[PDB]
Every structure is written in structure tokens, then in C-alpha cells.
Design a protein around this ligand. Sequence first.
Ligand SMILES: *Cc1c(COP(=O)(O)O)cnc(C)c1O
Ligand SMILES: *Cc1c(COP(=O)(O)O)cnc(C)c1O
Ligand SMILES: O=C1CCCCCN1
Ligand SMILES: O=C1CCCCCN1
Lengths: 426, 422
Amino acid sequence: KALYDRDGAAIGNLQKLRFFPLAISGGRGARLIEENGRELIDLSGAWGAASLGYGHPAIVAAVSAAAANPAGATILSASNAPAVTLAERLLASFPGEGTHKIWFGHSGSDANEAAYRAIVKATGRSGVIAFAGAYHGCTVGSMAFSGHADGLILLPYPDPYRPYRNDPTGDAILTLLTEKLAAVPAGSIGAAFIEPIQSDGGLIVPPDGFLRKFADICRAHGILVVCDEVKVGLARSGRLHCFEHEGFVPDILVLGKGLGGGLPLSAVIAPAEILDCASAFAMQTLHGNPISAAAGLAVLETIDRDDLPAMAERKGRLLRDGLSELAKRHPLIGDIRGRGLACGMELVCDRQSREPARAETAKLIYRAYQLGLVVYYVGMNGNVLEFTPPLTITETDIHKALDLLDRAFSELSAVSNEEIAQFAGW
Amino acid sequence: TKALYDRDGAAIGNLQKLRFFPLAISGGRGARLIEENGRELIDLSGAWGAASLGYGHPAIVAAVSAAAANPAGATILSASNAPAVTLAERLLASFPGEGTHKIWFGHSGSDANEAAYRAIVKATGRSGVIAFAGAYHGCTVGSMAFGLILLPYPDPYRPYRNDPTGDAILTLLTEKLAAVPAGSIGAAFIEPIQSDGGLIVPPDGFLRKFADICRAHGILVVCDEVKVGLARSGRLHCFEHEGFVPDILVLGKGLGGGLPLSAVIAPAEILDCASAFAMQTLHGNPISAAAGLAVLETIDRDDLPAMAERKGRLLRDGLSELAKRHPLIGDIRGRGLACGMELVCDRQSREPARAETAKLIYRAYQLGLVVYYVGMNGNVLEFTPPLTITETDIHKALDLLDRAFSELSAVSNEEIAQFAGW
Ligand SMILES: *Cc1c(COP(=O)(O)O)cnc(C)c1O
Ligand SMILES: *Cc1c(COP(=O)(O)O)cnc(C)c1O
Ligand SMILES: O=C1CCCCCN1
Ligand SMILES: O=C1CCCCCN1
């Protein structure tokens, strides 16, 4: 009878990543509306896909006009204007050069896979560098180089809070890179996949200067540098593109989630020679469909019009300030990290040992949900709270979210172990 | 203010291009695409079958606008949402079905087929697969994976081992199964009309028989209806023409009526075997879901399978008259508004007329008609228009098609060469 019960009866568990019985019938701004009418503040923004929140007027206007008069449904066998305009608008925002082209997909998973397959096709080099704990996607293609393909080389992420080999600079990781590359035929690696802030590892910001150095090693060895900005892309970091923080430019940019503002849309920006090496090669019927592309353009126009990078920078300091405020009261909070409106809070059993508090995290978000706050956890040990709110979230929503979060830290023990065991999580 | 098609060449890479002619679209209304210059073309492609309701259908506009205005979140991964749930129930209500099956939502047929295969392997441990030569299950690593028993599709127009019944294919199947351990094959993937093969309807009874053999061996029958499902065949589900019910149904293309939306209908045990297993962030998103609902609602409301059956016969009847005037036409085939026309150099030899097929669609494009070719040989014109296409739209496209056949020589080899196509 209830919506959550019906979901359990109609929809298989295969795609479920449930942390609590959240059941939604509506949305407005940064709020989700449960079946009964209860309002929750969404600090997850659907893992960041709701870039402009819910029922944003520019999304509404864009998608309504597109549905009323659609330019076909595909970029495969026809050129259509909404996609071409979006392709140029994405091209404009990327420097460079360039000589760069767009590939459109439905998701970050299909875009990382396309990027990979295009590289191997264009160059003949199938080897891949990727980072341990990396999330590039859940398709057979994009999982092949995600964290736990042949010629896959996995490196530790430069994690300040848990430095590899207890070297805080990351120099040991670059040294490992170097040892790994010479154990392998010269010119055999075609690509290096990089998250500028590592999402699934625990929203990890790498040590300053590391990515630039890593890219320089890559460029010196013929290896194309692929920046996977699905989670942290497009203004979320407080800059239009997250690599703008790291003093390097990737050869390839992968975009997703927030790009569609609520509709399935991803994109690969890659040199022309990579995307033109084949035709009819990586394709799905509704790729570059006009409704998705229209929304994508409404996201970009709104980013520019509202200076959303500047907003995300502002609202992110406000959010991190408040979280530090909570640390001063709650011993579980070991680490606050992030850029713009991509923030992570690591919870630990002891601030010195920095041992992961998995059970408390699960109870926390469950309680948070009961109080009216949607937040999910992420990370290797399930101990990292992830904050990726709509970029249009108001300061008033953030204050309210902080009060509810404070309340959820205090009221955590209320959650029984059997309530938590109802929900498999990751 | 360059040409739209030229702007396309400069911004968008070749990787996903399946281009046969310089079609550049700025609008759509019903079964008509509107090019940049304001010429309306009758769409016989319906975007490879995705535009099931055509362009600007009121039901899609109303549902999409309302969904955009008040979205129940953006995902089904981490929240339950009402539109996704309502649509899941509706799809299960359309299948038999009750309490045995569940729904998994995707973006596309490729991911839906990939999810079905991964779920089966995970649930049953049986990784072995049966599939048909020339099959199209999608264009991702996961969906092009299909260890493998490959069979010829039973094509009445091109029999296997000199057996038009198709019974030699059932015999080969029996041999391959006997040759490999019992319980090593988990799944059989079938198109009930083979799309990439060139819209081939198999001989009567073959698939029913094929399904028996599979169940006899503990093998799940997966019916891939991404192209040909949802009212398109003259029934809601194409397997209803075939006298069997599959264990798993894959749906896509027309399902979103223009948005990306796919679905797997599978036994609960297959879909409940693991969690956080096969998932992408925008899966089950409410804007696609609402669009799926509008499609299912319109199918029932404007009796679209019956309309497809009517308009299909009228289309194929018209093409048989073209065959009386144009010797190129060798076989007209299909169910409902999913039709194929195989073009041959001799009707007895059945030798494929590839070169002439390319010119035909290029020519037809110039005339105001959107239509494409498929098949291993590049000689089968696919007809998959909006289920909404009008009786007037059909007659009008038949005249243009007639005119296209008469004017093939007007299109040169150098014009054909400018477009890479397949
Ligand atoms: C979410 C994500 C993906 C995959 O996108 P989907 O839409 O879930 O397929 C890939 N890479 C990163 C870094 C992501 O965050
Ligand atoms: C189109 C199609 C697919 C794949 O759908 P995409 O959206 O192109 O990935 C799979 N099977 C059949 C029969 C199809 O027609
Ligand atoms: O059937 C088709 C044509 C091939 C490209 C993918 C869309 N679907
Ligand atoms: O980072 C995430 C969580 C895993 C499910 C896909 C959405 N993105």
C-alpha cells in the first residue's frame, strides 16, 4: 500500500542503493517531497545530478519547449540543432586546443567507456592507468578500468588523510607510477583516467601539485590524460571545470550527471583525431536526443547567467564552516574536505588512529533521513558522508541542513541495528 | 550562421554517426521532421523506432512538462519515486506477470540487455549464452559480449541447410547443447523479428519450438523487443504472435517516446539476486518515467496496436504494388508498423542490391522521405514510423517511394561516397 512497499514489490534489487525508506512523489528547489507531503532537504542532489535542483524554471522552460517541438530524437542518423548548439557551447568552454569534438551519451558510464574504446581504436594502445577506489562506471566497458581490462595499472590515490606509504607529498605514488611504467612495453599505455576529486574513495581532494606532476609524467610517455569530471564537473568545485584547480589541462574531458540537470546526458570532449577515427562505432539510439540536450543547455546557460561557480564557492565555504562547527562538538567527525559544493565528512572511531566508523555512519544518515535530511555515505569503509547539493541551494536551506545534521549526530543511538539491516547500502 | 549540417561536422565527432544523407533537423510535428529550411519530411524511420508517438504528441508534452515542473527526485537507485513505481506496475500488469516478475529500469536497450546478461550469470552461475548470427543487442562492450552458441536466424527468404521449415536450425541447436555440459548455458537471446538481419519474421512455429527446447534444458528465454515491442507489431508485445511467453523481456527505444528509457521484465529471483549491482545515476528518473507512462497510456487509449496492424497492412499492400513496377523489390516482410523491403538484383538469384539501396534512400531523402537500410548486405529498407503516422502520411510516402525508385540514377556514386553510413 505505501509507496516504499510498492517499490519493493515492483522493482528488483539489482539497481537499488538504498540507505533508508525514502519514497518520493515530488520536488521543489533543494527539497524532495515524500508520498505524504513531508519535505526533506536534499544534500545529495541525487549524487549531484540535480545540478539546478528540482523544478528549476530554466529546466522546465527548456524541456517543455523541446517536447512540444522536438528536433527528431537522435544525433546518430541525423544532425539536430539542440545537440549541435550544446556541442559548440561545451566546446567554447574548453581550452584547448582544439581541434576538439563532442560525443554525447546517456551517462558517465557510457561516456568513460566511449572515451576508452575510442582511444584504443584511435591509437592501438589498450593499456590504462587508473586509481584504486576509482569509480568510472557500472557497465562492463567502464568497470574494466574502475577500482576493485588487460594492461590495467592501478595506483593509490594521493589521499592526504591516509597517505600512501605514509608520504604526505604523494612522491611515493609518482615513484610507483614510474616503476610500473617501465615494467611494461614503451608506448603500450594509451590512457590515464583521473578523478580530480575522488568520489567513491571518499570525496578525496589530492595533495596540491600532485595531478599536474602526474599529468607531466603521462604526457612524457605518450599517454592521453582523461579527466573524469562526472561528479565534480561543471561549477560544482567552485570553478567551471575542476581541473582549473590543479594547474593542468586534460586531453579529454568526461562529463555527466549534473550536465543533464535531471535528464540522462553525458559528453566526451576529446581531440578530433580521437573521435573521427571511426564512424557508427560507439552508439545508442537516443544519444544526443533533443530533450536531453535542451536541458543540458539550460544547465550551461544558468551556470553562466547565475555565476554558479562563484555561488558554489560561496555556499561551499558556508557549508564547510558549519561542518567544522559540528566537529568542535562531535568527536566522530575526523576530516572535512572538498571543493565548492562537493564536500566530504569522514567519521572515525578515534581521531588519532583514524579507524573507520562504518556502523555509526549508516545510523547517522538513517536518523538524518527521519529528521528530514537526505544525505548518503560513500567510501571504501562506508564511513564518509557526501554533500553534493543542488548548486542553487539557498543559505537558509544550508543552515537548516546543519541544524538537522547536528540533531542527527546527537540522536544517532536511537537507530536500532535491525532498522539498519533492512537496507543493504553498497 | 553556417549550414546546420556543416556545424555538426565541426562540433560532433564521427564516432556515433550513422549518416546516409545530410539530414539536419530543427523541429518535428507528428510523423514529420522539419529541417532547418522548413521542408517537412515524412519520417518512415521514427528514429529507428524510438519516436513511437511521433513528435510533439500532446500526451508526451503534458507528462514531460509536469514531470519537469515537479520532479520526484532524479533517480531510482537511492530513492523510490512514484513515477518509476507507477510505470513498473503498469509494465508488470502488461506482462504475465503476477508476483513472479520484477522491473529494472535503464537508459537504452544496450544497457538493458547488458543488465539481463549480468543478472542471469550472477543469479544462476550459468554464463553460457545462445544467440543468433546477425543479432543486434546493443553497441556496448557488455551487450556485444553475445561460451556462445551462435545460430542462424530462420529466414524464410534465406533458409539454412536447404530447410525452409527451420527444423535444421532446431537440429543444430540440439547438437550444440548435447556437445557442452548440461547446465552450462544460462540464457537464449532472441529477437522475435530480427532487426539488423533486415526485419526478418521467422517461419511460423519456430520460436515456440525453440522456447520448448530451452526450457527443457533449464535455459532462460530472453525476448529482446527493443525495436519491435510496445504495440508496434499489431500486438502490445511481439511474442504474442509467436505462441510462447519469454522468461525475460527487454524493452527500449519507443518506450520513452523520445526520451531514453529501457526496462527489463525478469523473474524476481534474477533481479533480487544482488543489490547495487547494475546501476547508473539517472536510471528510473521521473522525467523519463513520466514519458514512459504517457506512452503506455496512449497505447491503450488510442488503441495503437490495432492502429499499427491496420496501417501496417496498408503500408505493405502499397509496397506490393511498387513491386509490380520495380523489379528490385524481392521481399516485403514484417508485422504491424515494423516492415522490411529487401532489394535484390534478381528475384530468383536473391542477390543483394547494396549499391542501389544507398542511392534509393539518398534519393528518397531529397524527395521528402526519411528511410534507412539495414541487413548484413545493406539491402533492406527499414520502415518503423510513429505508431501515430496518418493514413494520408502513408499514401503520400508510398508515392514518394515510387518516385524514389524511378529516379535512382539521379544520385551519383560520389554523393553516396561522402557519407560513411554503417
Ligand atoms: C557517477 C559517476 C560515474 C557514472 O555515471 P552514471 O550516470 O552513474 O553512469 C562515472 N564516474 C564518476 C566519477 C561518477 O561520479
Ligand atoms: C536499438 C536496439 C537495441 C539497443 O538500443 P540502444 O538504445 O540503441 O542501445 C537492442 N536490441 C534491439 C533489437 C534494438 O533494436
Ligand atoms: O537499429 C538501430 C540502428 C543501429 C544504431 C543503433 C540504433 N538502432
Ligand atoms: O557516486 C555515485 C554512487 C553510486 C551510484 C551511482 C551514482 N553515483
